[PDB]
Scaffold this active site. Structure first.
Site, short mmCIF file in Angstrom:
data_model
loop_
_atom_site.label_atom_id
_atom_site.label_comp_id
_atom_site.label_asym_id
_atom_site.label_seq_id
_atom_site.Cartn_x
_atom_site.Cartn_y
_atom_site.Cartn_z
N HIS A 64 39.51 36.61 44.38
CA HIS A 64 39.60 35.02 44.69
C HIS A 64 40.39 34.61 43.43
O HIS A 64 39.76 34.79 42.20
CB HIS A 64 38.38 34.67 44.81
CG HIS A 64 38.26 34.56 46.19
ND1 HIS A 64 36.83 34.91 46.68
CD2 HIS A 64 38.87 34.76 47.39
CE1 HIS A 64 36.73 35.36 47.91
NE2 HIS A 64 38.07 35.04 48.49
N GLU A 67 38.68 32.56 40.42
CA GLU A 67 37.32 33.14 39.79
C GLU A 67 37.76 33.97 38.58
O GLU A 67 37.52 35.08 38.41
CB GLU A 67 36.70 33.90 40.90
CG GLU A 67 36.35 32.90 42.02
CD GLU A 67 35.69 33.92 43.08
OE1 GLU A 67 35.83 33.22 44.30
OE2 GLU A 67 35.23 35.03 43.15
N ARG A 122 42.59 29.79 46.01
CA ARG A 122 41.73 30.84 45.96
C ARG A 122 42.42 32.05 46.80
O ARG A 122 42.12 33.19 46.61
CB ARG A 122 40.66 30.34 47.22
CG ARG A 122 39.70 31.18 47.91
CD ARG A 122 38.96 30.36 48.82
NE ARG A 122 38.07 31.23 49.77
CZ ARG A 122 36.84 31.93 49.57
NH1 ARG A 122 36.36 31.73 48.08
NH2 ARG A 122 36.16 32.56 50.03
N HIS A 192 32.74 38.57 41.84
CA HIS A 192 33.09 36.98 42.30
C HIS A 192 32.60 36.15 41.23
O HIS A 192 31.80 36.56 40.60
CB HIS A 192 32.74 36.89 43.83
CG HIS A 192 33.73 37.59 44.58
ND1 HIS A 192 34.53 36.86 45.62
CD2 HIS A 192 33.51 38.85 45.04
CE1 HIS A 192 34.90 37.81 46.18
NE2 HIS A 192 34.41 39.07 46.47
N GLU A 266 27.77 37.88 42.01
CA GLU A 266 28.42 36.20 41.62
C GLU A 266 28.18 35.83 40.52
O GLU A 266 26.86 36.05 40.13
CB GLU A 266 27.82 35.41 42.88
CG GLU A 266 28.34 35.42 44.11
CD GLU A 266 29.70 34.87 44.20
OE1 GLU A 266 30.46 34.44 43.33
OE2 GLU A 266 30.57 35.16 45.25
C1 LIG Z 1 31.15 30.17 44.75
C2 LIG Z 1 31.23 31.61 45.61
C3 LIG Z 1 30.05 31.62 46.10
C4 LIG Z 1 32.61 31.50 46.14
N1 LIG Z 1 32.57 30.74 47.31
C5 LIG Z 1 33.55 29.71 47.55
O1 LIG Z 1 34.37 29.54 46.53
C6 LIG Z 1 33.44 28.75 48.83
C7 LIG Z 1 34.40 29.40 49.98
C8 LIG Z 1 34.74 28.24 51.02
C9 LIG Z 1 35.54 27.42 51.06
C10 LIG Z 1 35.73 26.21 51.90
C11 LIG Z 1 35.11 26.33 52.97
C12 LIG Z 1 33.95 27.36 52.93
C13 LIG Z 1 33.74 28.19 52.05
P1 LIG Z 1 32.99 33.44 46.71
O2 LIG Z 1 32.91 34.10 45.64
O3 LIG Z 1 34.41 33.32 47.44
O4 LIG Z 1 31.86 33.78 47.83
C14 LIG Z 1 32.22 34.90 48.38
C15 LIG Z 1 33.21 34.48 50.01
O5 LIG Z 1 32.90 33.57 50.53
O6 LIG Z 1 33.90 35.38 50.11
C16 LIG Z 1 31.05 35.78 48.81
C17 LIG Z 1 29.71 35.65 48.21
C18 LIG Z 1 28.46 36.28 48.79
C19 LIG Z 1 28.70 37.33 49.66
C20 LIG Z 1 30.08 37.46 50.16
N2 LIG Z 1 30.29 38.67 50.95
C21 LIG Z 1 30.71 38.33 52.43
N3 LIG Z 1 30.73 39.36 53.31
N4 LIG Z 1 31.07 37.06 52.66
C22 LIG Z 1 31.09 36.92 49.94
ZN LIG Z 2 34.99 34.92 45.31
#
Ligand SMILES: CC(C)[C@H](NC(=O)CCc1ccccc1)P(=O)(O)O[C@H](C(=O)O)c1cccc(NC(=N)N)c1
Ligand SMILES: [Zn+2]
Length: 304
Positions: A64, A67, A122, A192, A266
């Site tokens: 992403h 990040e 993102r 992430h 994370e």
């Molecule tokens: C702050 C962290 C949690 C990040 N999340 C975001 O940026 C939010 C994404 C989002 C944006 C708009 C609406 C809903 C969700 P991420 O690193 O993108 O989170 C991952 C993702 O959503 O792809 C993530 C976190 C934990 C587990 C997973 N694994 C998975 N298979 N989903 C994936």
């Molecule tokens: Zn991410």
């Protein structure tokens, strides 16, 4: 110039992949496993003391774009590897016995965009038919209950799952590589930020992995190890209940390929700075994360 305690643009990271490889040919080989939508080279570093039929751990960063601490960690990890090999007994044994496949930046196109245009981007930067909206969420683009939950079918949305699983050149490239090396890859680690968590499957369903007790025990020990350095607190558990249900993620996909140790990390923080983590926290973040990664590696190796 490159710095391990600053965020580096892609041009600099790319030059670094060449330089660190050139400076450590007895510990690093560099390959390209594909091109991005915009034609950037998806580098993969094979870190380890070369030898026949070695098992491997696979780690990627930069899924992403925004990040930035993720990209920073993969670079930090590689330096620690090459500097401490032969001196620190654990890393020495790690690199003698296995290879780390380190993919420093997967979503290069998006990362470049966070430097040139929008820091909070993102997704990838691929075009979409019938709309001006750009990009697919790479971590909604894998064949793991693809697009069934926690994902959008709208290209204008941040969690757009794509036109189909592996529709993005970058996710196809990663999936192809992992599929071609399943006999050797024993763990999959995807980096992430933010939230200070270690997640394991599943996120696309509330069902639990067959070895969920082991994964919980492993994640528990990894977060304990991480905390020993600076006191940073991580939580852990299955993705779906620990953060949110979401389909099409690479951790779930890799696990269903038979890679029994699959984790999404994370990193810092918990929202004070969020994605915009100050460069002044890069070193501490990476050092404590190293302890968790080394713990997992030591565990996986000791259980071959
Ligand atoms: C702050 C962290 C949690 C990040 N999340 C975001 O940026 C939010 C994404 C989002 C944006 C708009 C609406 C809903 C969700 P991420 O690193 O993108 O989170 C991952 C993702 O959503 O792809 C993530 C976190 C934990 C587990 C997973 N694994 C998975 N298979 N989903 C994936
Ligand atoms: Zn991410």
């Amino acid at each position: 110039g490159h710095s391990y305690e600053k965020y580096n643009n892609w041009e600099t990271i790319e030059a670094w992949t060449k330089q660190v490889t050139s400076e450590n040919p007895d510990l690093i080989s560099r390959t390209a496993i594909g091109t991005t939508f915009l034609g950037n080279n998806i580098y993969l570093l094979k870190v380890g003391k070369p030898g026949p039929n070695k098992p491997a751990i696979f780690m990627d960063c930069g899924f992403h774009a925004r990040e930035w601490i993720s990209h920073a960690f993969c670079q930090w990890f590689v330096r620690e590897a090459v500097l401490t090999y032969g001196y620190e007994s654990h890393m020495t044994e790690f690199l003698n016995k296995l290879d780390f496949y380190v993919l420093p930046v997967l979503n290069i196109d998006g990362y470049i965009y966070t430097w040139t245009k929008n820091r909070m981007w993102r997704k990838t930067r691929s075009t979409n038919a019938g709309t001006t909206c750009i990009g697919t969420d790479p971590n909604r683009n894998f064949d793991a209950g693809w697009c069934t939950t926690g994902a959008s079918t709208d290209p204008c949305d941040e969690t757009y799952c794509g036109s189909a699983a592996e529709s993005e050149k970058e996710t196809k490239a990663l999936a192809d590589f992992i599929r071609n090396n399943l006999s050797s890859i024993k763990a999959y680690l995807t980096i992430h930020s933010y939230s200070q968590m270690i997640l394991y499957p599943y996120s696309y369903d509330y069902k639990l992995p067959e070895n969920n007790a082991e994964l919980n025990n492993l994640a528990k020990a990894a977060v304990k190890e991480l905390a020993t350095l600076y006191g940073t607190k991580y939580t852990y558990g299955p993705g779906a209940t620990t953060i949110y249900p979401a389909a099409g993620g690479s951790d779930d996909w890799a696990y269903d390929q038979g890679i029994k140790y699959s984790f999404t990390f994370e990193l810092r923080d918990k929202g004070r700075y969020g994605f915009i983590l100050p460069e002044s926290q890069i070193q501490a973040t990476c050092e404590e994360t190293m302890l968790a990664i080394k713990y997992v590696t030591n565990y996986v190796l000791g259980h071959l």
